Amino acid sequence: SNATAYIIVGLTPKDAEKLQQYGARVASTLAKYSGEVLVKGSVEQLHGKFEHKAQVILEFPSREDAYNWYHSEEYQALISTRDLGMDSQFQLIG
Amino acid sequence: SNATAYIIVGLTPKDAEKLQQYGARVASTLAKYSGEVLVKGSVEQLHGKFEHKAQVILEFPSREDAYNWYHSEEYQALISTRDLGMDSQFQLIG
């Protein structure tokens, strides 16, 4: 009944150590915007092409809350190290 | 809990009428495998690059059903018309 919003990530691991620093710190950043990991996992290609190894999907209670999470100061501090840990794409939907 | 599985499509519309036809047929193919559309929508890009205009996420009760759906007889017939209506990528997480 509400307009649930989603962030889709498409990713490829680079630096393992850095990727684990990133992953460790993020979950906290989500709970202020009521973020939640719907699924994560490796890709099996069913059609077309896709440049990435794995996908993660975040779920928020509202588009505005998804956008605000990505743009929060607590998440943004995570970014320089996220990019060392993985090349990715993020898409906001909703 | 069970291991709910997902199909993520990223798409770019081509022929609106071929597309209409596709869209109008897929659903009946979903029910067979307990498929459900989690979400449909245009993309605002948060980070990095993404070739498509829009994403759709499909939710199935398992990876078996998700794969069986895509490779099902009745969905496979919809493909020819699908590919005329849109360029797309289908990823299987599950």
UniProtKB/TrEMBL annotation, chains A, B:
It comes from the Bacteria. This is DUF1330 domain-containing protein. Residues 4-92 form the DUF1330 domain. Signal peptide: none annotated. Gene3D superfamilies: 3.30.70.100. Pfam families: DUF1330 (PF07045). It comes from Colwellia psychrerythraea (strain 34H / ATCC BAA-681) (Vibrio psychroerythus). SUPFAM superfamilies: Dimeric alpha+beta barrel. InterPro entries: Dimeric_a/b-barrel, DUF1330.
